[PDB]
DNA sequence: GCCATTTTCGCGGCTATTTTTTTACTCCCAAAGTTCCGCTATCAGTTAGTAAAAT
RNA sequence: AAUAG
């Protein structure tokens, strides 16, 4: 899960294109960022965030969750 | 594309079934092929190629 | 009209594996149906652009 | 046809 790419989360073209601005690759990488950088991401709406946050709870997985030795 | 029918189907008769629209027809068939080619859900279909 | 003799008819094991065959030969014409290239014209699909909406 | 059983 953690190394999947983020087009496997099914986000909508704006929420992509913004997490690709932020160059954020893989799963484990948008999960360890929380509302610090999410909310700061120009051009990424206040709906946006809710979006991303229902998609992660429907994977079991939260924001800013802390792993070890990533990559 | 005529999966489950004898016959296939222009966008005419499609849209003959509810609302007789050729571009609306057009875009959800479009819509459709795009989930369809999401990663998620076309790991199954992508081993018969 | 039955007793014998001659004439057809059908038969002669099961599994494998190697590998083609070959003569013989008019012509012309007019009439008819078919094909192949090129052009037209219509419809449907695809794509580019722009406004409508939403963030 | 030839060959093996």
Redesign the pocket.
């Given at each position: 899960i953690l190394l999947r790419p983020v087009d496997d989360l099914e986000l909508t073209v704006?929420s992509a294109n913004c997490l690709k601005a932020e160059a954020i690759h893989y799963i484990g990488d948008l999960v360890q960022r929380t509302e610090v950088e999410l909310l700061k991401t120009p051009n990424?709406?206040?709906?946006?965030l809710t979006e991303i946050k229902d998609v992660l709870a429907s994977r079991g997985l939260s924001l800013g969750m802390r792993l070890e030795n990533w990559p | 594309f005529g999966i489950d029918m004898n016959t296939d189907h222009?966008?005419?008769e499609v849209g003959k079934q509810f609302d007789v629209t050729?571009e609306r027809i057009?875009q959800i068939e479009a819509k459709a092929l795009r989930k369809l080619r999401h990663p998620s859900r076309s790991e199954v279909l992508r081993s018969f190629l």
């Open positions: 704006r990424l709406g206040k709906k946006s | 222009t966008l005419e050729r057009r």
